[PDB]
Nucleic acid binder design. Structure first.
Lengths: 228, 108, 335, 335
DNA sequence: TTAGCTCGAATCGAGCTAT
DNA sequence: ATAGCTCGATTCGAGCTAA
């Protein structure tokens, strides 16, 4: 039938068909871009919303694995012993002055990492809050692991605009954020027709590229980056 | 209490297998628990192994099973430090008490 | 701001070899090079029920049934030949140096501070008093743990190897040198200053330690004990297995180093029982009671952290103990 | 615009073999072809609590209870025989060449410019400084990592095996050529153009390196350690496992090649440590830190793009670091 | 760094569509 | 909400001057 596109995923059918049993059948192939994840032979009587439900569990497992393997580093605020965790914050990057540390009594508050070779830094509550404000991680910061490092960089000379498939990771009905194109356009203060030109694929007539400020502001508003 | 039934239900279905399955040669076959795993080997050996279950009265298999379940508890020092591991050991002692009680009067 | 590293592993200094066992006759010790090695043999044993019952096994109906079928065991034993009454052991001991340098560290500022802390210690107090007590533990055969408890006469020979040939030979008598008194002797000071040469990194030290003990004609010696997987039958349980390297009963290398570490005397509890091994939290496995408790703040870590971080130098007398644990090495530094 | 390639997988040069270890006595190293191999055996240990406690296990009742419940584990131990004091490690090293050519590279324009950049480096100066420092690590027993820290006399013999036979022989003293400085020697320079010819690609070259070390009788040798799947019982925990191929303890090939890689003295930090291995971001496993961090712009990746993309070549000593990392090989490019 | 200016090319909004 | 279009107006980059 038709190739079902769910965000960065694309379920394309086989051009030829087969007859498993007596009923008509086709091979549906799940794709994550150029990566093939599954082939499932399905009847032709299924609707698109039912093949979507058939392939939904593999997509859910992929999203769980992506969220787990790209989780931001967690910092821990502890007392002068290191046993009780008073507050924990997930950070996009570690503090600059972290070194290998074991808490002692001369300082009341210590900011240690969650990794077992715990780096640390003696802080007060005011400096801890300054570091937490500066270094905090957005709730959907795990999607940055699925994106290239040259589309997320803040250096304008080394920045490359995201493609349509890399843009489907963060905007779209079946995206990893779950926001529609109209909602993304409303977040950028532009028309939905212009954003559809950003998300347009294979239509070489009137296809546009997103800009540096628009891309980084969209990543700010969706909760993916720059939301410390 | 539900653990020792399916442990006994496990030994229930070993009673339907060959009478001398544990009597075959082998470098490692857990001979310490073989007095309870294979009850039907006493019929094949009238005196070589029937009196082995009679004389020894194996009840340390439950102690071996107790060491196994000690790996199945959460390895938290908070439970060991506090009294959480106390009644956990009290329920471990009593639940292995009637579990081992079944094994000694198996010869009846 | 300087703080302790998360990992502070130290390599082990004064690493001994595995001490062999060979048997022979007394006064033949000057030609004991080709003495026959002590071989582990096998005895099948049984034993009556002698362990303390739990007040539920004390009924005469089942207590008498307990001795009806006593347990059977197969024990490994190490005995001398009939025409031999002297136990001979041999191992080599090296002295490395660089106690303050850790094998692995995390904080560069803390590693530098620890090196400067141990550098000031060496100039203020050289590696001499620790080297002396390390010489006494080489002098008396404390590494013969229970092989000397009732020995009539124990003699220890200590050689020094430079180019495969002995340079200076040290001969001591272990019965005169007690296990509780750390006295002064001219021969021991010659040994101690050689230990100090290796500890300070001046030169290479390789000591071949040979000890002779008078036990008796064909008695039993007591080597190191291994572990048994216990996968056999209930009659051949094999409850005991002794260390042997190549068909010869031997002692673990960490067993030899444990007795060589028995120099710690200064723990805040009463010292009438004798010296103990230098370890963090001052513990010996014999009693199961640890000296230098963190509540009394005389352990390794409280003394080390105060002397490095807070610059709280203790007396000269305990800082001999914090360096002593740096000698044995360790995996100090938790998460 | 000459963007960098997404895949830049590079084959590694200086491929070493596994270092087999056999034992024996000194002065017989001229006929060391039938020395018995260093065997892997098993021994059991127990220890006390020597780790820091999380402020809750420091209670005297809890601490003594842990001593009353000791941790029994078995360990993998390798020792010399009691009549043997010499340890020899034998591996073969083959030099490949063609270091500038990647196995995988997307942009053909980037490959041509990278090959042009490597060829520009070769014309200015060959692989002479590289092979001089490589032969210096072959001169000393750096690949004999922890068996050299207490060696009394360690000696290497390097043989050029062209047609399965010794085309040219070498004999060095490893203690004289220390692991701190890279000086000049006529015999070392004679070895230098042998690897330099291999690195340039003129012809096939293959070496055999045998390093005899005066360890001591029955002393502890240190081969490469293995991973434990951690599935068996806690008593038979097997907390340590060493590497062996056929009942003979050996050292990993990448363990040997890492020591030969230790030529990087050009990192900006102070030289109290000394040379390190040439790998990107300058990672030191023991110190848990990284020299040549990308912040001060002296790592491999920023220098490579500066040299190739925008044509600003680095310093000549930094150009040695880039090519040494190119000789080292890796999965470069945006993975 | 301020303060602009062409010139072709890409983008932007607001109309419609299709599915 | 997806997907895409046209059309005229606005923006955009890389040259340039001007100071």
């Amino acid at each position: 039938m038709n190739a079902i596109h769910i965000g960065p995923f694309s379920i394309t059918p086989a051009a030829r068909g087969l007859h498993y049993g007596g009923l008509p059948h086709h091979q549906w192939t799940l794709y994550y871009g150029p990566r093939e994840m599954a082939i499932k032979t399905l009847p032709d009587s299924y609707t698109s919303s039912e093949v979507r439900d058939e392939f939904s569990d593999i997509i859910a497992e992929f999203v769980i694995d992506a969220r787990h393997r790209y989780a931001p580093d967690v910092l821990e605020l502890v007392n002068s012993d290191g046993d009780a965790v008073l507050a924990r914050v997930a950070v996009s990057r570690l503090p600059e002055a972290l070194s290998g540390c074991i808490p002692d009594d001369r300082f009341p508050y210590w900011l240690l990492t969650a990794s077992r070779p715990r780096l640390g830094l003696p802080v007060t509550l005011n400096e801890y809050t300054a570091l937490a404000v500066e270094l905090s991680a957005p709730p959907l910061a795990w999607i940055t692991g699925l994106l290239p490092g040259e589309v997320l960089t803040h250096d304008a000379e080394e920045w490359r605009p995201p493609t349509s498939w890399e843009l489907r990771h963060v905007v779209g009905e079946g995206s990893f954020t779950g926001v529609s194109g109209a909602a993304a356009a409303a977040l950028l203060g532009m028309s939905a027709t212009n954003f559809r030109k950003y998300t347009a694929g294979d239509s070489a007539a009137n296809r546009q590229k997103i800009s540096f400020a628009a891309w980084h502001y969209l990543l700010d508003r969706l909760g993916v980056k720059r939301a410390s | 209490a539900q653990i020792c039934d399916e442990a006994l239900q496990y030994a229930a279905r070993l009673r339907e297998l060959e009478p001398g399955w544990s009597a075959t040669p082998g470098c490692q076959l857990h001979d310490a628990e073989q007095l309870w795993l294979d009850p039907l080997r006493a019929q094949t050996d009238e005196t070589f192994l029937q009196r082995r279950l009679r004389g020894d009265w194996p009840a340390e298999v439950g102690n071996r099973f107790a060491n196994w379940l000690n790996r199945a508890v959460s390895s938290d020092s908070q439970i060991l430090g506090s009294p959480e591991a106390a009644q956990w050991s009290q329920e471990l002692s009593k639940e292995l008490t009637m579990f081992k009680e079944i094994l000694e009067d198996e010869r009846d | 701001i300087l703080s302790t590293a998360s990992v502070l592993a130290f390599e082990r200094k004064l690493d001994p070899s595995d001490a062999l066992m060979s048997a022979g006759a007394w006064a033949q010790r000057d030609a004991s090079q080709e003495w026959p090695a002590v071989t582990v043999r096998e005895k099948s044993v049984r034993g009556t029920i002698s362990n303390r019952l739990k007040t539920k096994d004390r009924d005469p109906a089942k207590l008498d049934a307990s001795i009806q079928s006593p347990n059977l065991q197969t024990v490994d034993v190490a005995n001398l030949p009939s025409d031999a009454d002297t136990l001979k052991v041999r191992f080599t001991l090296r002295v490395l140096g660089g106690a303050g340098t850790p094998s692995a560290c995390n904080d560069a500022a803390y590693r530098d501070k620890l090196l400067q802390t141990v550098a000031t210690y060496v100039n203020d107090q050289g590696f001499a008093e620790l080297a002396r007590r390390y010489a006494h533990n080489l002098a008396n055969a404390r590494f013969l743990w229970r092989n000397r408890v009732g020995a009539e006469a124990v003699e220890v020979r200590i050689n020094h190897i430079r180019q495969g040939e002995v340079a200076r030979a040290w001969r001591f008598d272990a019965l005169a040198i007690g296990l509780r008194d750390f006295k002064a002797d001219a021969e021991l000071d010659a040994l101690a200053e050689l230990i100090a040469s290796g500890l300070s990194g001046s030169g290479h030290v390789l000591l071949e330690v040979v000890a002779f003990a008078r036990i008796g004609d064909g008695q039993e010696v007591f080597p190191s004990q291994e572990l048994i997987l216990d996968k056999g039958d209930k009659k051949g349980q094999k409850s005991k297995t002794l260390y042997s390297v190549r068909d010869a009963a031997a002692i673990h290398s960490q067993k030899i180093g444990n007795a060589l570490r028995t120099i710690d005397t200064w723990y805040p509890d009463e010292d009438g029982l004798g010296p103990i091994a230098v370890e963090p939290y001052g513990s010996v496995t014999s009693q199961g009671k640890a000296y230098r408790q963190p509540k009394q703040k005389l352990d390794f870590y409280t003394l080390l952290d105060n002397w490095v971080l807070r610059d709280e130098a203790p007396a000269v007398e305990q800082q001999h103990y914090v360096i002593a644990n740096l000698i044995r090495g360790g995996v100090f530094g938790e998460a």
